[PDB]
Paper text:
During the crystallization efforts that led to the monomeric apo- and peptide-bound [name]-[name].1 crystal structures, seven more structures were determined that all exhibited domain swaps, leading to dimers. The swaps are located at the exact same position in all structures (i.e. Lys-36 in the n-Src loop), clearly visible based on the high-resolution electron density. Dimers are formed by exchange of the C-terminal 25 residues, almost half of the entire [name] domain. The interface thus generated contains a short anti-parallel β-sheet encompassing the [name]ϵ sequence 36KSWW39. Superposition of the [name]-[name].1 structure with the bound [name]ϵ peptide shows that domain swap and tight peptide binding are mutually exclusive. The C-terminal half of the [name].1-binding sequence would get into steric conflict with the second [name].1 domain in the dimer. All of the dimers are swapped in the same manner, but with different juxtapositions of the second [name].1 domain with respect to the first. The hinge at Lys-36 provides quite a bit of flexibility that allows the dimer to pack in many different crystal lattices. Indeed, the hinge region varies over ∼6 Å within the superposed ensemble, and the distal loop covers a distance of ∼8 Å in the dimers. Given the large number of swapped, independent chains present in different crystal forms and grown under different conditions, swapping seems an intrinsic property of this [name] domain.
[name] proteins are composed of three N-terminal [name] domains and a single C-terminal SH2 domain (reviewed in Ref. 3). [name] recruitment is required for complete T cell activation, and its inhibition dampens TCR signaling by reducing Zap70 phosphorylation. The objective of the present study was to initiate development of an inhibitor of the [name]/TCR interaction, specifically by blocking binding of the first [name] domain in [name] ([name]-[name].1) to the PRS in the [name]ϵ subunit of the TCR. During our studies, it became clear that [name]-[name].1 exhibits conformational diversity and can swap half the number of its residues to form a dimer.
Residue numbers in the entry:
A (entry chain A): 5 to 61
B (entry chain C): 5 to 59
Amino acid sequence: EVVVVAKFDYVAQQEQELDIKKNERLWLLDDSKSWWRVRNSMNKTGFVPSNYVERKN
Amino acid sequence: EVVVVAKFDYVAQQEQELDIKKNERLWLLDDSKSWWRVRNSMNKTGFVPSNYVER
C-alpha cells in the first residue's frame, strides 16, 4: 500500500464506496485491477474485477 | 440493451466484492469506469473511481 492523494471530492453512492475529499491522503490497497460496479438478479451490488464481466458485443 | 453476464465465477474476497456465478445476468452501473480500493486515516475502506486518486 502506497499513500495517494484525492484529486476531487467523491460522495459514496453505495455503502461499498468511500467518501473522500479533495487533497485527502489515502492508502491505496489495490490498484492491480480495474474493478467494476455490478448488480445481480438477486438485487445485490458490489465490485468485481473487470475481466470477470462479459458484455455481449 | 447490451446483455452482460458473468464471464467466469468470481469468489468474493472482501466485503465490498460481489460473488458472481458464471453466465448469470449482471447489470453494469457504469460505462467501463474503473474503481480502486482505498483506506482513509480512520481505517475505513471502500472503492472510489480510479481517476479520482493521484499516485
